[model samples]
Target: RVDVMDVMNRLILAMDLMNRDDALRVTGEVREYIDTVKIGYPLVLSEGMDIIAEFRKRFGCRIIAGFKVADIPETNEKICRATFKAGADAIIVHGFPGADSVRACLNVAEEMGREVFLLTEMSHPGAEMFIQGAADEIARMGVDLGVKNYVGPSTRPERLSRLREIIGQDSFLISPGETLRFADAIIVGRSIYLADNPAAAAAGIIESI
Candidate 1:
């Protein structure tokens, strides 16, 4: 849960309050959230790249860097390039940009030796109509393009479960759009931020899963 804004705010809060060990403290808080089950971007940028590096240094598990990147090819190339440089374990990009631009990102990722996650299905209402087919195309392209699926997910847990059936186990599945809270992982920004204790909220979301 949580997004970049919430994460940075917490980090600033920790900093302003004279918590030099903000890095370690924040990691513990986010880990607690992970234990509950879900964690993503707000935790990354809010804590900064150093913290992500630290998390990897300390916890070998792959932590998803929740930067939902969507832009033109050049802009995306710059963003994706710089982000992967910061040690992002995975990056999410909207495939609506079509195969050409999407291919550019795949190329850059290849050169940089980075991971590319193609966002096929988002959770917004009216999403169900076409993602099934799109997922098929992505699967075919993924092997060749070094692309992987990063779905926003349906709100219904059952539907989220169905996604696995449609795409099968070979592809990556990131669950963000569901309020059920529990997910493989979620790019929760504003939703988690609004809670009294953002980390606590994340923990609750995780536990729900």
Candidate 2:
């Protein structure tokens, strides 16, 4: 298990920067107040493992690769290992692809002494039709596989509340899109990045929670 229950607080700054300097600046300014750093597609693709390595070396905080891992069993395992090798303490994987794919990542994570957060639902328009009821099932499946971390959309209070019940109170659940949701941690992007002062912006959001 990831044991994020003892993390510094419930803030995970979304370090989704396309520019290396911007990411460096943001982390420098805001890393102290945040519990973890969520590295995403653009940043990961642009800088690869080096970005993850650098963030870990500088901040010494938990790192989550925000890659919604979805692929064949073999590929899924490979992706998990790669991200973990890149210094990610945990990684996000999609549960829609079924147990085998989820297991592929889980197996690698177990071997590497890392953790995995299966994406049961997302914070996008099209996700509703697919994730509504299915999210509950994935939560159960993930728990059965000994997974303790999860990602569910927290755009709405009711949706988040229900997901919380399904995932259980003890499991680590990080909700993206909105910071005010009732979750273990809230992931925010533009709110911090597009702000006049990223550190204050992040602190404001974290304090609000």
Candidate 3:
């Protein structure tokens, strides 16, 4: 069975906004619609790592650090340790760097009682150059590494389905866009955060689902 996280209505907000005030305001506006938020480097770099703790204190939501960690084993370990310490419920890591690097992050997560989400495929158009080619292999690697959570691109259904097939039915998955046929939760970014009314946008998406 797919063990969905504490995400409400199968929705996760990709709060990539860099402005602290605006990010908090937009996120607070849609607090009723989502219980989990994905924070990436842009927001964290601009506002600082403490922003993770602040998000938890202010919204009481599960924070998934979208760091997409890609580094050597030793460096990956330190990054995961610091991120988990900063209060992230889970951290996203890139699987293309090989098993050793991924294992480093996974080890930190295991010790911290947290989770590591393996990012297999990226959604951008430019990703077709190399990421698209290596995506399937990356997904396979993640399964071999015993990863339970994953992030796939919502832009391509066929590729996403292939990823799901590789990961199997028991693993948890999150992706961007409106589809939930494969993913356990859908991630929304500018659609909600940049909308004229963030709450309404989030509510409409939930209703559509």
Candidate 4:
């Protein structure tokens, strides 16, 4: 339900606002909006590298460095390395990152001791332009990788059946769409803040499953 441009704008605004606060002041109060916020490549590359540390300090450990990474195997390795150095506990990578790039990222994950997550699909329309055919690859790659899978585009937990078909028993799943099930974890923002009763809605959604 949000545009890439708007996400960039909000990130800039958030960075500005966070600059005025102390480290301890950063709390989960914003967790409700965490999933709603996604900074694309243009804004991030254009902003600066230090922004990641600033974001980590501002949001503490809540921020995920390099939301959706896209680049060659070499570049992807460097990018994942940078993101890990920035203290990102988790990262989102493109499923099309290819087996080589994906393994490059995995290598970085081991070197940096950080976790890497890949996007199965996106939240916007026409995402098939780049996301098609990724499902099978993601499933196969995740077989050994275990968990570390993500789903999107307003779906239900049952949608995860497709993913669960491939991932592991202890694998972790992050859902970014309109809140669904089957995810060991789900990231929801607008659904929590823009609902008839944000708190109640969140409770209901969780209780539904």
Candidate 5:
């Protein structure tokens, strides 16, 4: 089983801002409270590899390219290569594509000595139609494919707990929401970004857990 105490912090700053300036400002403030940095579609597509490169250079923390990569083996492999080359410590991939597709990306991560986080389930209501009942199965499949990191929903506390059981204490579980229990870390975005003082907001969350 993995020991949480040996790990650094369990807070990941979800930098999903479209505007580079605004994103950097928040990152500068709340970064100290986080162990990893997650860059979503907005900043990724807008600032491209520069953002990833700059974030790693500045923070020297683990970077997760929150792209939820889902495509053919060739496409997934290429994207994984680009993402790692750009400077991410890991990349979030969609589990819907099955083991082979995920393997394609994992191969790249393995080659680069990086990690791959499987999106076992999503928090949004829309994702339920497809991911609700089978979240655990997806996570198990991810384990079989050599993935040790997973994404669950913080709002679904029960689901998160169940995932922990399935993936075990040694694997990592990062959920999206403010709740920190049953997760190796929490991915928070708007809560910190929209707050009047992003640093204070992050501090509050960090202290609460």
Candidate 6:
């Protein structure tokens, strides 16, 4: 299991850059400041699943596949299996799909000796339409399913707090932004990767923390 202590200064770089060379360069630039990275579809779809192994080889950083799995149990199992096979330390799955779906991912995680991070609420404004409504129950469901990790919304402090309340104190929680008050670690993407000096941007955030 990847503990919260594995995270460097409670900062996770959301390396969403699509170009392989650029992604590697930007991530390498901030290697000293961050030891974990969230790699989503943007880069995976563009660079292939091998990128996960590449990051591990180059930086020795823990890779979380932020695929946001939200599908049937069978499909979820397949996705989780493939992600873990690609060498991810953890994979983030959406919790709104109900216990069965979440369980599928958890089962695969257990078998492979990897981890799953349940995504409760989204960071976007439109999440209010439906996700915000069910986010609490989803968090509760995750707890019931024995989820040890979670992903919450940085845009909504109250919701994030509510999620933490439902999941309790032991679970490792990650969210987007610089505030580590509620989450175990903060996820940053454009704020770091898009900066003129990615290393400096990451260092600044760590320094501010």
User: What's every prediction's RMSD, in angstroms?
Assistant: 8.2, 2.2, 1.2, 8.1, 2.1, 1.6
- Candidate 6 — worst ten consecutive residues by lDDT sum? 1-10
- Using all chains and alpha carbons, the TM-scores for the candidates as numbered come to 0.58, 0.92, 0.97, 0.66, 0.93, 0.96
How many clashes does the backbone of model 2 have? 0
Candidate 6 lDDT, tens digit per residue, 31-108?
999889999999999999999999999999999999999999999999999999999999999988899999999999
TM-score of 4: 0.66
Point out the worst 10-residue segment of candidate 5 by lDDT.
1-10
Candidate 3 backbone collisions, by pair: none
Displacement of residue 168 (Cα, Å) in model 4 is 2.9
Task: Write the number of the candidate with greater lDDT, choosing between 1 and 5.
Answer: 5
Show model 1 residue runs off by greater than 4 Å.
Answer: 1-26, 30-51, 58-61, 124-146, 157-162, 177-209
lDDT of 1 by residue, 44-158 (tens): 5555555556655564434444455668888888877777787655566767666666776777778886666767566665656775446545545544564545454646677
Report the candidate with higher TM-score, 4 versus 5.
5
CA lDDT, every model vs. true structure: 0.53, 0.82, 0.92, 0.54, 0.83, 0.90
Enumerate residue pairs that collide in model 6: none
Worst 10 residues of 2 by lDDT: 1-10
Question: Which scores better on TM-score, 2 or 5?
Answer: 5
- Candidate 2 stretches with Cα past 4 Å from truth are 1-5, 177-181
Find the candidate with the highest lDDT and give its number: 3
Looking at candidate 4, what is the lDDT of residue 12?
14
Per-candidate clash tally: 10, 0, 0, 1, 1, 0
**Clashing pairs in model 5?**
2-170
Identify the runs in model 6 with alpha carbons over 4 angstroms from their true place.
1-5
The per-residue C-alpha lDDT of model 2 at residue 14 equals 83
